[PDB]
Scaffold this active site. Structure first.
Site, mmCIF file in Angstrom:
data_model
loop_
_atom_site.group_PDB
_atom_site.id
_atom_site.type_symbol
_atom_site.label_atom_id
_atom_site.label_comp_id
_atom_site.label_asym_id
_atom_site.label_seq_id
_atom_site.Cartn_x
_atom_site.Cartn_y
_atom_site.Cartn_z
ATOM 1 N N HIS B 41 58.504 27.861 30.581
ATOM 2 C CA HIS B 41 59.046 28.625 29.467
ATOM 3 C C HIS B 41 60.053 27.822 28.647
ATOM 4 O O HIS B 41 60.577 28.372 27.684
ATOM 5 C CB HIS B 41 59.664 29.965 29.924
ATOM 6 C CG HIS B 41 60.911 29.848 30.756
ATOM 7 N ND1 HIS B 41 60.971 30.223 32.081
ATOM 8 C CD2 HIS B 41 62.163 29.444 30.427
ATOM 9 C CE1 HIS B 41 62.199 30.040 32.538
ATOM 10 N NE2 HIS B 41 62.937 29.555 31.556
ATOM 11 N N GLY B 143 70.928 28.784 31.345
ATOM 12 C CA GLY B 143 70.813 27.351 31.433
ATOM 13 C C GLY B 143 70.510 26.846 32.822
ATOM 14 O O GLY B 143 70.199 25.659 32.977
ATOM 15 N N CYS B 145 67.929 27.601 34.664
ATOM 16 C CA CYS B 145 66.513 27.521 35.009
ATOM 17 C C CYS B 145 66.102 26.080 35.254
ATOM 18 O O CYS B 145 66.566 25.161 34.576
ATOM 19 C CB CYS B 145 65.633 28.106 33.910
ATOM 20 S SG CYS B 145 65.835 29.867 33.698
#
Ligand SMILES: *[C@H](O)[C@H](C[C@@H]1CCNC1=O)NC(=O)[C@H](Cc1ccccc1)NC(=O)[C@@H](NC(=O)OCc1ccccc1)[C@@H](C)OC(C)(C)C
Ligand SMILES: *[C@H](O)[C@H](C[C@@H]1CCNC1=O)NC(=O)[C@H](Cc1ccccc1)NC(=O)[C@@H](NC(=O)OCc1ccccc1)[C@@H](C)OC(C)(C)C
Lengths: 306, 306
Positions: B41, B143, B145
């Site tokens: 993503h 942030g 991820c």
């Protein structure tokens, strides 16, 4: 979101851990520039530890009696000296992995990460707090002495703790990196009183702000209190007296959340007088006191290092 | 002695964390040999996330649209590909810090360390468990991820988790390093049911053995029970059914301590039917289930790595 007992990344400290052997005793040392730091009781036999004369015992030792092993690499010891309860072994090679570092003596109620080590090799990392009675509640087996505690400020590692001993209770005692014990303890194997511990009130309040920020809240009441009134409740419950300095330190969290500190104390007061009713806060059924206000700001700010 | 929620030393993983930027989105990637792994993503806008067609979105991207930054160092992207929910960016430089590693898909009830990261830089490390419902209860801000979970076997890092999302509850979901989600989750911003969680019974029993080994004990009763009888109590209390395999796994701890497993279940049964009476075990007022039997053996064995 979410809130966890979080340790600093340990890579900068892993690169400094070495093995120190003197006769029969092996423990961990900390290798920075061309010096290795370790507990001075590495020079004691099992019998010496009941009543050691460290000066006299150290005089029987020469540089070549200290075996320092870095991984498999082999450091030459070219000088040695005692500073308080630590030995400083001068080696002929500066650690190429030395981080920017400082030695600091932390205050009770502050927190730090422990890198637990055996035979010079890291085993695990966990966070904890210097208790008001200058003990820590760690996880240390035989061979863990010389493991260190530390904080990181972006690039700079602040070493604040070196492990020396366990007490007949399961709590742990040690020194700063200049070799001065935290608390009244001495490095001999004789009975030693830790003394009454107390709960770090400012840390509990910070955790309650952490809880509010993460949606957990049932405890937020309705009441308020005064600093003198709450402090009456603190003493009945073995909590450290809350000062205005503590109130000022909680000023970022009070303003992010919009909850006055004395309102939060009124919530804590009711928690202390009524219990948890079998409820939980941030996944705990106890009031947690090993997060500082700065631990909380960090945790929900995303501050990084290296 | 002592017993702590302990994370693996994170130095081997710190050396693999990089920053990945695609347009407006920046997250963490994992750099091993000449490949960088990150959540797919990273290619989504804030609008794309409600209903992304990842194939169609990926087609609009070229190698030079992926900015990969390692510290300040600058990797050239020379290929890219989607594998399930991860992107694999081929870079022109193999990570000189690549540890011996493996990709593993862990089972519910197992534990691992999380290195939480922002902008490619490590912020902290903590242990946790893959819940029976395939969520984790972590600490992840915007942030984070692409942060990874892992275990270490002496020299070899077994990566088992990459962080993708938070659910409207504060629990966290992610993939193995082949990009397959744990649990039923998908990477789009739409409501998603985690489903009923249960307590990891074999882990709670291991912790009770840890407690006994560390002197905490008031709970050791007098009773015994049967596997079928205890399992009746497990269901009333949302505990995972205890199998003979679980009994065999607890066989080191039962023999070190001299307490039969079904005796320990009888203790746990009474804990579940009567509460803690405001007592504590290993410093907790709840029954802890995020230590595996091997976590306990490790913890009180002093196993090291590197
Ligand atoms: C070093 O690797 C090792 C780690 C400890 C062992 C298990 N957990 C640990 O943290 N430490 C030691 O073995 C030191 C060795 C020592 C200390 C001083 C001088 C010489 C040698 N000792 C201890 O940790 C003991 N603690 C202790 O002596 O406390 C004071 C005391 C001792 C005896 C009776 C009353 C008071 C430990 C091992 O002993 C107890 C406290 C019983 C756990
Ligand atoms: C990546 O750095 C970031 C970390 C999370 C932000 C705060 N904590 C985190 O762990 N993750 C995200 O922002 C992802 C982005 C994404 C995910 C899929 C496709 C495209 C982009 N999203 C989330 O974490 C959301 N979770 C989510 O969508 O869950 C399903 C859902 C969403 C909305 C309504 C119902 C169900 C987070 C940010 O949103 C919620 C769940 C409300 C916290």
């Amino acid at each position: 979101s979410g809130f966890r007992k979080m340790a600093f990344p340990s890579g900068k400290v892993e690169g400094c851990m070495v093995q120190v052997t003197c006769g029969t005793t092996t423990l961990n040392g900390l290798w920075l520039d061309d010096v290795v730091y370790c507990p001075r009781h590495v020079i004691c036999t099992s019998e010496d530890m009941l009543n050691p004369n460290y000066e006299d015992l150290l005089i029987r030792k020469s540089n070549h009696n200290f075996l320092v092993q870095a991984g498999n690499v082999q450091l030459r010891v070219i000088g040695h000296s005692m500073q308080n309860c630590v030995l400083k072994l001068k080696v002929d090679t500066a650690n190429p992995k030395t981080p920017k570092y400082k030695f600091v003596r932390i205050q009770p109620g502050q927190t730090f990460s422990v890198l637990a080590c055996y035979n010079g090799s890291p085993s695990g990392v966990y966070q904890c707090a210097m208790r008001p009675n200058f003990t820590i509640k760690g996880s240390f087996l035989n061979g863990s002495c010389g493991s260190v505690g530390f904080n990181i400020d972006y690039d700079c590692v602040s070493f604040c703790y070196m492990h020396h001993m366990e007490l007949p209770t399961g709590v742990h005692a040690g020194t700063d990196l200049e070799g001065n014990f935290y608390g009244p303890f001495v490095d001999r194997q004789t009975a030693q009183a830790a003394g009454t511990d107390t709960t770090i009130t400012v840390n509990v309040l910070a955790w309650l702000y952490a809880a509010v920020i993460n949606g957990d809240r049932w405890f937020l009441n309705r009441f308020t209190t005064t600093l003198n009134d709450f402090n009456l409740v603190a003493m009945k419950y073995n909590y450290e007296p809350l000062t205005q300095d503590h109130v000022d330190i909680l000023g970022p969290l009070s303003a992010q959340t919009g909850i006055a500190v004395l309102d939060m104390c009124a919530s804590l007061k009711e928690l202390l007088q009524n219990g948890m009713n079998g409820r939980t806060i941030l996944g705990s059924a106890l009031l947690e006191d090993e997060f500082t206000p700065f631990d909380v700001v960090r945790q929900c700010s995303g501050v990084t290092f290296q």
